Symmetry: D2
Subunit: 287 residues, 4 copies
């Protein structure tokens, strides 16, 4: 009987962990702030005291953490993953991080006798809740296979992209496009309002043509309402652009558009919108 | 009842052809007369100048490259203003700035003509298919009179108010499109540098919230490295230029648009002006 | 006996016209808002009702106007320059405009039997007051020569750069560099203060090294004081960057840096700093 | 009394040599041992590893490429930490981020050594001439002890407080420098395209409020098309990278620096990494 661990019960991790419990897996959870475990425990998960405790006890442990710093602290820190993982047990880090971080975590886990897979996802809060994430995995093939039933509870589509690092790279490339699309939509709507245009009509014109997409439809309504309930935290969008630009630096790939969008998201953080939805970059694009 | 058509380019050719096939009485003109031949063969008449067309046709449509071209056809010798009058209509469907369309409308109106701007969203194929989105602004009665023709050209028609509003909507829409293209281009460039399969990148994009026909279509050009022209790169650069100028007038900062504009200028300088606008990829990837 | 006209008594024009009056020239002034003529008349200038009136009666008329729209309006508008210029009388437009504007004005002036010279300047309010401008002239060589004594009252350095358009291009190139230097200084000081560094020390380090220049010294003090009394209006710097980017468009010259600076200056305008010194772009660079 | 010097590059070589000529007892090391030969000929001693240098010298200076290099020399096998102790000092003059210098400082101090960061403003010639501006931060007793050496290396030395403050000041200063270089380069590129004389442009600049030694010196490279290396283009790009990352940590947006950073990356991609940083011009002009 395969048992599951889950570290990081945030906006994404909460719903993802809940999906595993509801699918009927034996799930052990941990979160830095213990209060976030409560709803998962009430659903039937067991609470653990540290990442080390989870990885010592569970056949497959999944992590869904904020950023490279969080991922590294949970792996390498006191009572962290490396103090418990071993004996073939698996660690699947689904956090969005850079390829150097995922590679380092994987090498460490492997050296302790664990198996490692990175599996960042495309899809926001609602997809996490619904189990319709796109999973971008890379690393240990036997672990990818073993986690199949769990991935089916979490996502609608699962790819294995090769060696550790390719998953992170795919995720960063996809989100770099997304960040620039959001600033494009935001600048368009800001200019539109200054033009006296009806924002609803602008969205209707976009939805009838070749650019029509669900993100424009959904985020567009936030722009009209001026309300930005958080699906994907603006601070994490800015983190992903930061990471894309750093990746471009390492590969010798110039990214004028991404760099510009990165700085606009930094402006939005500076102006106090870090914890709002990433669509809230609009608040520093419109006057 | 009678229609005229000025500018038989990538967009104007198919548009005029739709009006002829739909049975409208169409008189065409183009700066380069050779472009008229195919439409004459379909059943259009041919005229020697815009003034000649606007003097004889109840409603004249223009589909020209840029504000300079629009202004030259309107204000130039043997131009629109020398023929328009008597309530006859001029519908400029060229993508231009609001100052240009406003100026053209004022002059047309002063001459006793009716003016409507009606730039479109949709590229070569939609123009061929008659599935354009028409963004009209200006004279209400002319918009009404143009209904049957618009139905042959487009799948959707809006009247956005006073002259200028159509030009603003179009520039806003194309500004988003220009930034989406550089975004896809930068992503594919980084992805290929990362050793990722470009096809898989497109597949992930098509499975998620950003999925759209443009990424699907232009994505395949990025993979093949062939950029057959639907929307010329130079015209996209022109549109970004106009959007930045509009932002300037309205006091709207546009860091993203401005950066995309300069990347499209790099692509023009690198010799890709006449390729599809997706060829901006050629200056984004190493 | 050469008589002089002067159109546009703004931040630059007022002190420039005043230098001509103090040097002993017979000067006739006009300004759209006639109230700005009072101080010049008090110094000994005469006042006219229109540009046409000035250009019909004066041997050489100088204009120092805001922008291409102003220059074209004063030239081509009702009771404008073309209604009065003729008989070999000279028109010297010292406004900062694009090359297509100065070329068009020059052609129209010449068609009326006038002589035209464009002569934009490098140097701000204090140099205008002190008569230490750098004059970047292009156009009619006889008019350049005839204006020698007036130019000596206005500037410390005078160049003839060839055909009309060449002076405008030199001025726009020079100011494009200046605009980018101002955002560079502004961003540096903003980052520095965020780092807990002493701004005075930052300025001291810059002044001791290879970048040391009078602009950094002078504008640096504004940044420290938080007051931006106007030497060069922010709106006019933004206008100059706009024209440089449009010039680059025409010449097929990409300008990522200028384009970015242009947009930052637009932000500063939108935030209400249009009529402060251009160093006030700092107000939107700093948090 | 006794000194060590690690890293004999474009800057390190001339700096070590100034210390030898001033009569200091200097022991040098460089990853590539051949670089030591000229210093040894001047009267320096040579060591086999950073550990060896730091175990034997009262004060050791490092002048290394980047944070990667600085960390490897500190934390790696036979590195600084395996030798430093007993109150002996380590002065890292490399241009790195404040996180790197803080981490190095913390490790050195835990080993019983003293740490000072002291990055410098000034390029190859100032290094040769001993006219660097030294931007130190960290242990005060070490700053005082290093006074005589700093006097032979520089014309001005500041103590800016806790470790990290020197790195921040250096990155701020070089961020400005990087943007000035792209500004000058874009201006000269546009000017040449305008048919203006590049020499006259430089002359107009030198007569006005922007006049500075950097424009005068780099301007001549732009005219000649030769970029002999004073400050490697790859290190300028590294410095802008670090400024952008520092801005990220402090929540300070930097549109100008970010744009300049990407232009320098283009110049690296175009093959100019080892030329003078003024060679960014080669990707700004057409
Ligand atoms: N939201 C989305 O639409 C979306 C979509 C795809 C991918 N992602 C990615 O998924 C990951 C999680 O995002 P999210 O939206 O769930 O973010 P979130 O709500 O901010 O959650 C972050 C999680 O990481 C934990 N954490 C942060 N720092 C930590 C540290 N130093 N040590 C231990 N735990 C730490 C938090 O614990 P505490 O509760 O103690 O703070 C929380 O559990 C991120 O990489 C994000 O980019 C998000
Ligand atoms: N292609 C698209 O996907 C697309 C989509 C929506 C809107 N648009 C807009 O539609 C307009 C037409 O675009 P297009 O793709 O059809 O352009 P195109 O193929 O380049 O042709 C432009 C037309 O303008 C004419 N023209 C150019 N300069 C002229 C001048 N000085 N005087 C008279 N006529 C002149 C050309 O005549 P000649 O044959 O003599 O050169 C040609 O007929 C543009 O404003 C464009 O931005 C394009
Ligand atoms: N300030 C500097 O450091 C500096 C340095 C070098 C070059 N320049 C350039 O010199 C020119 C003047 O600068 P400035 O600082 O003197 O500008 P300013 O104080 O804003 O004055 C602009 C002048 O133009 C006039 N004007 C504006 N629009 C007009 C119109 N539509 N019709 C007639 N007159 C109009 C104004 O008249 P009203 O009084 O009626 O408003 C005013 O006299 C600008 O091109 C600027 O870029 C400035
Ligand atoms: N050049 C300037 O105008 C200037 C001005 C002020 C500050 N700086 C800064 O000063 C520092 C040195 O610059 P530079 O111009 O002297 O650079 P450089 O000529 O490229 O030399 C870099 C030095 O670092 C060493 N190095 C690189 N990677 C190493 C590693 N992994 N392990 C051990 N040593 C390593 C090199 O050793 P090898 O010989 O074995 O390769 C060389 O001695 C840089 O941080 C630079 O940004 C430069």
């Amino acid at each position: 009987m395969t048992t599951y661990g889950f570290l990081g019960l945030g906006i994404m991790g909460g719903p993802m962990a809940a999906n595993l419990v509801r699918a009927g897996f034996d799930v052990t959870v941990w979160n830095r702030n213990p209060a976030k475990c409560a709803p998962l425990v009430a659903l039937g998960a067991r609470q653990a005291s540290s990442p080390a405790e989870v990885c010592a006890a569970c056949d497959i442990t999944i992590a869904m953490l904020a950023d490279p710093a969080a991922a590294r602290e949970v792996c390498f820190g006191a009572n962290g993953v490396l103090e418990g993982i071993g004996g073939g047990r698996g660690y699947i880090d689904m956090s969005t991080v850079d390829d150097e971080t995922s590679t380092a975590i994987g090498a460490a886990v492997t050296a302790r006798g664990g198996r490692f897979l990175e599996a960042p996802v495309s899809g926001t809060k609602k997809p996490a809740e619904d189990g319709t994430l796109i999973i971008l995995a890379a690393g240990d093939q036997s672990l990818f296979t073993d986690a199949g039933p769990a991935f089916a509870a979490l996502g609608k589509k699962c790819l294995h992209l090769g060696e550790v690092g390719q998953g992170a790279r795919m995720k960063l490339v996809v989100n770099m496009i997304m960040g620039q699309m959001m600033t494009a939509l935001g600048e368009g709507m800001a200019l539109g309002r200054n033009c006296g245009l009806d924002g609803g009509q602008l969205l209707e014109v976009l939805d009838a043509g070749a650019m029509a997409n669900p993100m424009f439809k959904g985020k567009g309504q936030m722009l009209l309402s001026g309300e930005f309930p958080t699906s994907f935290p603006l601070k994490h969008m800015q983190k992903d652009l930061r990471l894309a630009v750093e990746l471009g630096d390492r590969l010798g790939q110039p990214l004028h558009g991404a760099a510009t969008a990165n700085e606009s998201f930094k402006r939005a953080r500076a102006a106090g919108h870090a914890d709002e939805d990433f669509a809230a970059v609009f608040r520093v694009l419109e006057a």
